[PDB]
Design a protein around this ligand. Structure first.
Ligand SMILES: Nc1nc2c(ncn2[C@@H]2O[C@H](COP(=O)(O)OP(=O)(O)OP(O)(O)=S)[C@@H](O)[C@H]2O)c(=O)[nH]1
Ligand SMILES: [Mg+2]
Lengths: 171, 86
C-alpha cells in the first residue's frame, strides 16, 4: 500500500467562502474576487497526528443551478466540510439540506462532517456562536469558526475532518 | 446548448482542475480567455496559450485557434483539457 488519501468535499451555499477556504489551505493565499464555482479539485500532502497523508479536496457549487451534480460527489466523498458564513443567516439554515442529502446518498446516519462558520474576521455577525455550537452538538459533529482571510481555524477544520474520517473507518 | 469542461494548468500549485462552462457557440479564443480568468492568468495575452484535450494516456487533441470547440473536440471521451503556453 502507499500513503493514505482522504476524499474531502466542501459544501455550502453560494458565497460563504468554500473556495477561499480551500485556496487559503492549499496556496496560503487570499484575494477578494467574485468567481462562482462549478466544480474545482485540489490536492495537498499534510501531516496529521504523525501520519503523512494526501488530502484530495473537491470544492463544489453553492449556486442551486448546479444542484444535480451533488449525488455523484456525495457518493465519492469520504468527509464533508459544511460551510456557512457567520454574517448570512440563510446560509446557516441551508446547512440542514446539505446534511440531509449527504445522509440519504450515503445511506447512513453518521457520515464524517464538520460544521464550519466562515468569515469570522468580519463584524456584524448574525449567527451567534452558541446557536451554531448547539446545532453541531445535535448533529454529533465538530464545529469550528474560520476566516479564509486571517487563517483562523483553516488547517484545523480540514485536519479535524480527517480525524473524523479516521474515527469512522475504524468503528 | 452547453456542457462542463475541466481545465488544468501545469504549474505545481496544488490545483488538479477548475471547471468552466462551454457553449455550442464558443470558439477557442473565448474559451481560452474564460479559462485564463478562472486560473488567474493575466500577465500574458491569450495568443500565447493553446487549449488541448486529453484523449487518452498518449494522445491529445490540440483545439485549433479559430475553431468552434464543440465541433473540434472529441465528444466521445472525458471533457478534460489542458491550458498551456505554446
Ligand atoms: N472577509 C472575508 N471574506 C471572505 C472570507 N471567505 C470568503 N470571503 C469572500 O466572500 C466572497 C465569496 O467567497 P467564495 O470563496 O467565492 O465563496 P464560495 O462559497 O466559493 O461561493 P460559490 O462558488 O459556491 S458561488 C468572496 O468575495 C471572498 O473574497 C472570509 O473568511 N472573510
Ligand atoms: Mg466557490
Amino acid at each position: 500500500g502507499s500513503m493514505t488519501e482522504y476524499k474531502l468535499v466542501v459544501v455550502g451555499a453560494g458565497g460563504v467562502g468554500k473556495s477561499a477556504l480551500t485556496i487559503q489551505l492549499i496556496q496560503n493565499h487570499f484575494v477578494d474576487e467574485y468567481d462562482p464555482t462549478i466544480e474545482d479539485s485540489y490536492r495537498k500532502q499534510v501531516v496529521i497526528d504523525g501520519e503523512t497523508c494526501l488530502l484530495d479536496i473537491l470544492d463544489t457549487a453553492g449556486q442551486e443551478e448546479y444542484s444535480a451534480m451533488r449525488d455523484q460527489y456525495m457518493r465519492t466523498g469520504e468527509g464533508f466540510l459544511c460551510v456557512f458564513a457567520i454574517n448570512n443567516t440563510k446560509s446557516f439554515e441551508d446547512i440542514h439540506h446539505y446534511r440531509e442529502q449527504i445522509k440519504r446518498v450515503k445511506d447512513s446516519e453518521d457520515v464524517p462532517m464538520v460544521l464550519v462558520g466562515n468569515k469570522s474576521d468580519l463584524p456584524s455577525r448574525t449567527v451567534d456562536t452558541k446557536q451554531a455550537q448547539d446545532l453541531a452538538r445535535s448533529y454529533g459533529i465538530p464545529f469550528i469558526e474560520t476566516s479564509a482571510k486571517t487563517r483562523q481555524g483553516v488547517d484545523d477544520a480540514f485536519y479535524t475532518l480527517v480525524r473524523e474520517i479516521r474515527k469512522h473507518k475504524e468503528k | 446548448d452547453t456542457c462542463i469542461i475541466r481545465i488544468s494548468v501545469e504549474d505545481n500549485n496544488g490545483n488538479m482542475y477548475k471547471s468552466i462552462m462551454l457553449t455550442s457557440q464558443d470558439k477557442t479564443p473565448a474559451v481560452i480567455q474564460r479559462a485564463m480568468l478562472k486560473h488567474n492568468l493575466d500577465s500574458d495575452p491569450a495568443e500565447e496559450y493553446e487549449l488541448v484535450q486529453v484523449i487518452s494516456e498518449d494522445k491529445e487533441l490540440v483545439i485549433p485557434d479559430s475553431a468552434n470547440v464543440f465541433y473540434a473536440m472529441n465528444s466521445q471521451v472525458n471533457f478534460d483539457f489542458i491550458l498551456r503556453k505554446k
